Ligand binder design. Structure first.
Ligand SMILES: CCNC(=O)c1ccc(OCc2ccccn2)c(-c2cn(C)nn2)c1
Length: 111
């Protein structure tokens, strides 16, 4: 939502939030509510929380100046998941699948 590359980023963001990917994207829709989920060590392990609603707010507010800055937040969101959770947890399988969607479309960035 701005430059050509940021339009491509906004397109990816809309796809990640779309019903097409909802079966595995839903844990990433909103900030992790650590207290609600009983994850009382979450904010000791994850210094920089990130989620798709925060990425959406930042895109809407024209916070991202380029595609690289947008991608860094999306990857931070996945990295937090891989850091906090055992690699055999259901949420990690969901993260892997949504990251596959992200990486393959991000690679189609217009020059
Ligand atoms: C290391 C222990 N982890 C958790 O106890 C845990 C539980 C639910 C989560 O999210 C809701 C969710 C996801 C998938 C299936 C069912 N419920 C999470 C979680 C969510 N995110 C983004 N990262 N971890 C962790």
């Amino acid at each position: 939502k701005l430059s050509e590359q940021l339009k491509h980023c906004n397109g990816i963001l809309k796809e990640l939030l779309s019903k097409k990917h909802a079966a595995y994207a839903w844990p990433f829709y909103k900030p992790v509510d650590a207290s609600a989920l009983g994850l009382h060590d979450y904010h000791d392990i994850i210094k920089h929380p990130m989620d798709l609603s925060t990425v959406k707010r930042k895109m809407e507010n024209r916070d991202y100046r380029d595609a690289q800055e947008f991608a860094a937040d999306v990857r931070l969101m996945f990295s937090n998941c891989y850091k906090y959770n055992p690699p055999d947890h259901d949420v990690v399988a969901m993260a892997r699948k949504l990251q596959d969607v992200f990486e393959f479309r991000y690679a189609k960035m217009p020059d």
